[PDB]
Structure 1
Amino acid sequence: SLKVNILGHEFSNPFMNAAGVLCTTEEDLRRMTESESGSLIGKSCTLAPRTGNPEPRYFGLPLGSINSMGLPNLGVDFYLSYAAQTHDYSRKPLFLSMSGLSVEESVEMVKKLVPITKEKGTILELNLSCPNVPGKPQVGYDFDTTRTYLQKVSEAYGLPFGVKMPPYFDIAHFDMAAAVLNDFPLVKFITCVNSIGNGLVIDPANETVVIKPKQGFGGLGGKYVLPTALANVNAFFRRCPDKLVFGCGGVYSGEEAFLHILAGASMVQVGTALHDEGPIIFARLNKELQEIMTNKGYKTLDEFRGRVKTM
């Protein structure tokens, strides 16, 4: 059994898309709904539509991806209408990611979600980590600013929600981040992690960067990020015992999913690998994770979630 029971919902399996991959348009979301994924999440949205950064803004790499999309999205009203009128909740639960570029914008957006969450059960993931908007640094790397967002969003939304965090690389930062998150009881899950921000890829043949925005600087995903993701998942799993942790980063196989769950993940998100392979990946992921559990004698994910062994 791959089932996950959290937030009052039954999820058929722990897999979903990472925000931003296969979730921007109505057709994208249809394809995620029809897939074997246990859930799905809408593109991080803004109050008004955006077309995003200029091209080229995505480059697939042997070890993953680099991107600077720039939050292209159809605007909050599109995703709310999708959540209210279009999505088939009998197939699977639905998350929406919101990434207002100011606390005021984020507050306006979540207020609109309230009635739809109440009526339909739509779940909010507040994005505190977009690394690709020029002039808008990651909110999650300023703990005073993070505290402000969480306060104002908690007050405006007033229902349980989650947060998408940037990756941290210092034990003191894990402690400081957890201290802020633990002051907000409505934050019921933490998604670790967003892209490793502001990497640079250069093509040796033409001596040129591979993406146009920000002088070539963009978010890294895929195989580059697995050990970082696992560390963040485990660090918050241990520091935030009354919250759930969702794993995101470097998942290409059931084995990586198993590691995320062992580190403490309740749901497992798939970005770069899904971009590479398409939504058929979720069928493969379910099969591979089931095999591993079968071979190890695990009847349910609860038997090993967060049970990574240390020396």
Structure 2
Amino acid sequence: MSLKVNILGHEFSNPFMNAAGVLCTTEEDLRRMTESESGSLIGKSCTLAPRTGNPEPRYFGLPLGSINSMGLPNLGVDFYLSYAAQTHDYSRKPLFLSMSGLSVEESVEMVKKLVPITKEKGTILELNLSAPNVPGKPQVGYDFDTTRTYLQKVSEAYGLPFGVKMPPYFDIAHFDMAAAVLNDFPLVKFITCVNSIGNGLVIDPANETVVIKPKQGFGGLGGKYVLPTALANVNAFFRRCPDKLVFGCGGVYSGEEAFLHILAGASMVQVGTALHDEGPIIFARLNKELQEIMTNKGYKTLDEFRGRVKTM
């Protein structure tokens, strides 16, 4: 029995990694992820210059998940590049970096810096097209013309295989249009589905007040709220983008949800809210739980059921 995943010319011990933004901002964060049982890890979505992000409170834990408006707090691209170039232990696991420049110009400058590091070390890029908590910046993934520009310029500047973190879509026509754009860019080798359900609003009945400070209380929703949306997006892109991998993100708290993501088409499974709650010990637990389910089903490898969800 094996949880191994072989993608992007790399071997992964298991399909699990952190979702970007969770346990991946500081060197301590990245060390802890690297020391974890996780199959991989990804750095915080970064910008050219550092950011401290939005004012507090900017995160609120909920019964059914989380709401956040972090605002892309990050140590700046130079920090993540230096981690990838000289700190990270690649013998432990592969490393992804999320890049989230707030303009095509910023992104282009950033991805150009990664090229030598990718060539030397094998560091993988995930382009963030779904930043929902920066005031005045729309989610790029909801604008297909802007998305096309980013993919074009990054394809030219970076010129190596990379992935995209997509916002959740809720309409068949949008699946179609998103896939049509993604399928024009052969360097896009994986799609991460999905980012937070953007711009939700939580109000505390007791004090009649929103629970987070930025953007009048509007923030991205994670956790149990997003599982059906995540599964749909994973499966939709899995079918529409056969020449690309899909990474599953959203609602993973146990082996059962991981199993569902993989059945829907996920190669890798990312863990956000649950990891924030439980810390890196979750990855040991997820490995155990997924193996239990596989044992019960009489499956030896992930390839026995990846993308094999049955319809009626």
Fold conserved (TM > 0.5)? yes
2:204 is the counterpart of 1:203: yes
- Deviation readout 1:260-280 (Å, 9 max, x if unpaired): 000000000000000000000
Q: Deviations over 1:132-188 (max 9, x none)?
A: 000000000000000000000000000000000000000000000000000000000
Alignment of 1:1-311 (within 5 A): 1-311=2-312
Question: Residue 190 of structure 1: CA displacement?
Answer: 0.1
Q: Quote the Cα distance in structure 2 between the aligned partners of 1:133 and 1:171.
A: 27
Distance in 2 of aligned mates of 1:32 and 1:42: 10
Structure 1 alignment gaps of length 5 or more: none
Cα deviation, 1:203-232, whole Å, max 9, x if unaligned, reads 000000000000000000000000000000
TM-aligned CA deviation for residue 128 of structure 1: 0.1
Corresponding residue SS for 2:285 = helix
Tell me how far apart the structure 1 counterparts of residues 84 and 137 of structure 2 sit (CA, whole Å): 27
Distance 2:89 2:9 in 1: 17
Partner Cα separation in structure 1 for residue 6 and residue 295 of structure 2: 20
Distance 1:303 1:148 in 2: 38
Distance 2:280 2:104 in 1: 33
CA distance in 1, matches of 2:94, 2:196: 24
CA distance in 1, matches of 2:208, 2:55: 20
Structure 1 SS opposite 2:270: strand
CA distance in 1, matches of 2:138, 2:277: 27
Shift of 1:116: 0.1
CA distance in 2 between partners of 1:288 and 1:53 (Å): 36
3-state SS of 2:165 partner: strand
User: SS at 2:20's partner residue?
Assistant: coil
Distance (Å, rounded) in 2 between the aligned partners of 1:243 and 1:121: 19
SS for the counterpart of 1:290 is helix
SS in 2 for 1:126: strand
- Aligned residues: percent identity? 100
Give the Cα–Cα distance (whole angstroms) in 1 for the partners of residues 260 and 11 of structure 2.
22
Once residues 292 and 9 of structure 1 are traced to their aligned partners in structure 2, the CA distance between those partners, rounded to angstroms, is 25
The 1-side partners of 2:196 and 2:104 are apart by: 21
| 1:299 to partner: Cα distance | 1.1
The offset of 1:63, in angstroms, is 0.3
Counterpart secondary structure, 2:86: helix
How far is 1:307 from its partner? 0.3
Whole-Å Cα distance in 1 between the matches of residues 148 and 59 of structure 2? 32
Cα deviation, 1:101-140, whole Å, max 9, x if unaligned, reads: 0000000000000000000000000000010000000000
Q: Which secondary structure state, in structure 2, belongs to the residue aligned with residue 267 of structure 1?
A: strand
Structure 1 residue ranges (4+ consecutive) displaced by more than 6 angstroms after TM superposition: none
TM-score, normalised by the number of residues in structure 2: 1.00
Distance 2:9 2:184 in 1: 22
- Rounded to whole Å, the distance in 2 between the matches of 1:27 and 1:278 is 13
The whole-number CA distance in structure 2 between the counterparts of 1:302 and 1:177 is 26
Measured in 1, the distance between the counterparts of 2:131 and 2:97 equals 15
Q: Alignment RMSD, CA only?
A: 0.2
Alpha-carbon distance in 2 for matches of 1:219, 1:239: 26
**Deviation sequence 1:47-95 (CA, Å, 0-9, x none):** 0000000000000000000000000000000000000010000000000
Per-residue deviation, residues 223-270 of structure 1 (Å, max 9, x unmatched)? 000000000000000000000000000000000000000000000000
Q: In the aligned structure 2, how far is the partner of 1:175 from the partner of 1:301?
A: 28
